[PDB]
Amino acid sequence: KKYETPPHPWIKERLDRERVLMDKYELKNKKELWKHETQLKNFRRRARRLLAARGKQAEIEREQLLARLKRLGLLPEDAVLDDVLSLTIEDILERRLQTIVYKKGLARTMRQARQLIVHGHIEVNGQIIRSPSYLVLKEEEDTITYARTSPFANPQHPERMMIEKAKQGGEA
Amino acid sequence: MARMHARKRGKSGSKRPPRTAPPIWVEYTVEEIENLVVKLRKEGYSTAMIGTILRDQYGIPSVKLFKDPDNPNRNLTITRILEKHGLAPEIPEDLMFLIRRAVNLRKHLEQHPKDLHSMRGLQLIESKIRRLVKYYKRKGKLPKNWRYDPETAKLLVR
Amino acid sequence: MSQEWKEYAKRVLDEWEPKTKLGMMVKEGQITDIHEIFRRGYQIKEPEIIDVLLPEVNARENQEVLDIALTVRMTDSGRRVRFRVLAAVGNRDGYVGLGIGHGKEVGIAIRKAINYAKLNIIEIKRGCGSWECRCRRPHSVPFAVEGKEGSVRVRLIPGPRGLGLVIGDVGKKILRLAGVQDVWSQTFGETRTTVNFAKAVFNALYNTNRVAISPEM
Amino acid sequence: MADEYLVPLDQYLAAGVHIGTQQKTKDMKKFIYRVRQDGLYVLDVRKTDERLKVAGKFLAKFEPQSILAVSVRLYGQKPVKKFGEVTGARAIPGRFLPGTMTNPAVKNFFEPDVLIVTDPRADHQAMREAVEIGIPIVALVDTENLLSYVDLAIPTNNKGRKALALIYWILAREILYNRGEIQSREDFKIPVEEFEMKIVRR
């Protein structure tokens, strides 16, 4: 499937973390958080199992899982299957479309950003998108823009004004 | 060390000489030893007691150490000295003494039958024989056609 | 928080009057090294000896209470209730003391326990090495260990970095106070009894050093 | 350590140090010299010379005066009292007044550096607290007394007064030798008699 909920769902320490996270990144539902936890879990689980086994097993398996994390951008230039396990649910959430839109300064604030991509006020590559989850690669970061849009077809959309007053990117 | 069999009682700790080659302050030839053995088997004594009297009189603790090497296939010792001559009983003494005794019991019981305990050792001695039989068959001192019974115990003794 | 650190220790060192020789040498600033109290097995008889080592600032002595129980003894025309409490002193930095205390009133017991716990401090040796490579810090324990307390059987297991403290909450409190980041927890036998389970985890984290290994050599 | 001359060999042997009582146990078997034809065991007299020497050393070492000689014995409390007068520290009680070591609320509270027991069987309490505090422990041990928890020994007789006298005497001599006042090779300034006990009125 594509979710997880820990053995006991109403536990306070688990719930606190989320609600603080919930405002921080401005999710719409908890499921979204979960998506990234459960995605994080799989990398870890596999990274760990690979390092463990006999070193002669086609190393390709390791390479492959270090390649993707580099490309995605979570991993920068570190060479150990142990740094992978040193990610957290915050790092994944930094990697989202939503986050990366606010960061660059295409949006005033993440709550605003939620509006933009839905109505097709953010282009990526040549395509528009509807899904704010969207996993944004490192190579993919450089290609976020406007062309046939309500934010940028002129220089007197109040939209331009709303983004300018803030001008602050960074972790969401 | 012990085995409390039909008992709870730890077994005797009697132990061998840790001598591996024999005393030379004691002195006998392969020929002299062989005579002593043959003389004693001629009396009516049996190999354990033959080894006993030789120990107590002639001062040889076990024959194997003194004798071998004189044909180093294996150790040369009492009954292996006897078999080469033809003085050996085809039944192993082990199995013989056993059965021997057994036939005596039966006669007691014959006259006296109200005996728990005496009945209960009949059962305890047979079942050692059975075993001692069972393995010999496979080793080969007693043919595979045999099987043990109290009429086939009264025939071997007589 | 910086220098305010010693100031609590020195404020304690204004009126602290040593009972022991241990409490004295510490109050003189000598052997200023908790670790150098442990190795030697010199008796922690004074509470303040520790307050001397743990200031406001760096390690942050995380005082914490687990369970508060109400028990009775029946007496002539009376039930005499009291309270038992379980408290945990520890620094995330690799020391820990587990304490329990019994008293008529509540507040007192908390206090008693807090004190009790100090005496029974322990180093937990963490896994420098890790599991896999000694990349940086001691994330885990070195070796898998087990606890034994009445019915309770806790295994601590080395672990992956980030796979953090995977145990029941009660222990999870104690462990965090130790400074084990990552550890697989295999329990066996009724935990309901908190005091023990805890005593388990504590005993366990205790036995760490008691393990004699090859890298020591 | 050093060879048994006289004073050393005539002193122990003249004093009934040798004569031990009933029971042997497996650990003590090493100091035990010989069997009489009665169950009365004799201790080795050499071993007593030997294990008294190192006991001048071991107690010349802890030079600060919080050495405690306690006794549960009626005989022994007099040699002990006199012994303590010379040295410079002693806990007197018929018992230990438990909470001598473990408790400092007690009005009688000491913090020793060494202990001397007389009978491991009677002074078990003084031992009991000697395991907790972290105190090394030197003593007088009999054919009947174990060495469990008892880390350094002086196998001597302790059941009688002459002996109970000789030892806390020769010892008071030995530690004063090491620390450097009156020697164990000079004849002691104090007479033996005070350490010796006597019953006129009870």
Add this chain to the structure above:
Amino acid sequence: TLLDPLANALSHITNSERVGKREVYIKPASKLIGEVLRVMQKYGYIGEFEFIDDGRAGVYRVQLLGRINKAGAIKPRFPVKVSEFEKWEKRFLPAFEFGILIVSTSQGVMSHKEAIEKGIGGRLIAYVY
């Protein structure tokens, strides 16, 4: 009777250890135990041993350093593939460091770590750590 004479050696050796005697005596003796103590010494766990072969039996007097924690035989003595090693690695041993899961092998006898470096396996014999 006895069986698993090895095991009755080992088990002494450990219960020996746990007391903190100085040296051991093992009354029944053998190749299995002999060989195993040999490999054990080779890794270093133990000090020196002498066996005296009495006309009765071999006996091993063994010197105890203090190193050994726990060292035990395997019950049905399972066959273990060189792929399944890792499983049997995680179970019996205390961590990746130690590596004397002593197996018996085509090459001879080895620890776990000496087995892996060659690359060969088989039925388990005993453990040591």
Add this chain to the structure above:
RNA sequence: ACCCGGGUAGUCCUGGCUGUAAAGGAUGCGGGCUAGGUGUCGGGCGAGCUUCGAGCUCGCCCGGUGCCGUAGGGAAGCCGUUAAG
């Protein structure tokens, strides 16, 4: 009914059947390993005593039969070289 005075089966012997129990040490059996102490029974050994008999005793050893207790185990009682290690 407990208490008292009579009383059959049975209780005894012989042969047979029946097969149960808190039939307990509530602790299946075998081997190896793991402080000790003490009392006791029988066997061995080195001595002293002697009524010249191992009769009276000391100690080591072997087999059995109790009690106490270190390490450990146990929930605790307890168990602890006669294991419940």
Add this chain to the structure above:
RNA sequence: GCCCGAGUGGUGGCCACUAUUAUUGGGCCUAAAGCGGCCGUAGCCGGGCCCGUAAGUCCCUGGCGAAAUCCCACGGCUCAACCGU
């Protein structure tokens, strides 16, 4: 007010929790649970030392256990699910 959210809840079934089925990984003095005790058949399990075989056992190669589903990569569909390599 808390949870979750086009879902959320009720009944039923299965698995987990339940080392409450014990291989991993349970017990059995007094908690359930030792047969009242023995014998030996079938079975399982076996002291040391040398030589043969190499049946188990390990190692290597080779024939082979369809596709799909699973796991990993890259690529495709706005995204993913899904599909292709």
